[PDB]
Design a protein around this ligand. Sequence first.
Ligand SMILES: NC(=O)c1ccc[n+]([C@@H]2O[C@H](COP(=O)([O-])OP(=O)(O)OC[C@H]3O[C@@H](n4cnc5c(N)ncnc54)[C@H](OP(=O)(O)O)[C@@H]3O)[C@@H](O)[C@H]2O)c1
Ligand SMILES: Nc1nc(=O)c2nc(CNc3ccc(C(=O)N[C@@H](CCC(=O)O)C(=O)O)cc3)cnc2[nH]1
Length: 184
Amino acid sequence: SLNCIVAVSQNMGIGKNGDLPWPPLRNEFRYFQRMTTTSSVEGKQNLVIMGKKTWFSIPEKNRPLKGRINLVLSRELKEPPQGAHFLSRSLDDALKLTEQPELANKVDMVWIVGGSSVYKEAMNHPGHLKLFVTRIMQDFESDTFFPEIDLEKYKLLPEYPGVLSDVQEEKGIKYKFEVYEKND
Ligand SMILES: NC(=O)c1ccc[n+]([C@@H]2O[C@H](COP(=O)([O-])OP(=O)(O)OC[C@H]3O[C@@H](n4cnc5c(N)ncnc54)[C@H](OP(=O)(O)O)[C@@H]3O)[C@@H](O)[C@H]2O)c1
Ligand SMILES: Nc1nc(=O)c2nc(CNc3ccc(C(=O)N[C@@H](CCC(=O)O)C(=O)O)cc3)cnc2[nH]1
């Protein structure tokens, strides 16, 4: 299945000057690490698809995201950024690549991890799509925003395996984990 994962502020912001609009939330990042890294199929890895700015928004010491196959999207870059496993010129080229048997046999989940335009194209992609959305319950100054969630297609699930639905809090900031789903 194809999955998006994101943390959004109340104003639906996701980035500010190539970083997150809020201070580091240690447990929310752990959640991101766990969901993207954990495969539900023994012996297979997970694969993350991300835009170019998101890739460089990750501290160099954490690149590539360990335990996961990192794929970057770019139309300008000649070579893949140092540390990336794959480069693709479009979202669909990347998805077509994950379906190649040499990959599919080693890959379980595909995770879209940003940025904005990558989120938008994926959420309108036809098929089975899940959105793992962390609702940060506080407005934050942002220059990049998450696109609209169409509630005529996406349904908020009341629970999901491995996700705590209770309100969380770190550094004084409250947030909750949500999961939306659509089929075709
Ligand atoms: N809160 C969160 O969950 C979250 C998640 C991710 C990112 N962020 C934040 O969001 C910001 C980055 O997001 P962003 O939307 O500004 O940038 P982005 O979408 O990560 O990257 C934009 C660039 O990626 C390439 N690209 C994107 N979509 C493509 C496509 N379909 N095909 C080919 N290339 C494609 C292009 O590079 P070229 O110009 O080379 O073609 C484009 O200029 C940062 O501040 C980051 O910290 C937040
Ligand atoms: N829910 C969610 N939260 C985020 O913070 C998030 N961030 C991005 C993009 N930004 C980043 C920035 C840093 C790292 C990072 O350093 N990841 C490491 C360490 C996590 C940790 O232990 O804090 C990793 O292995 O996940 C990941 C994504 C994309 N989707 C997200 N989705």
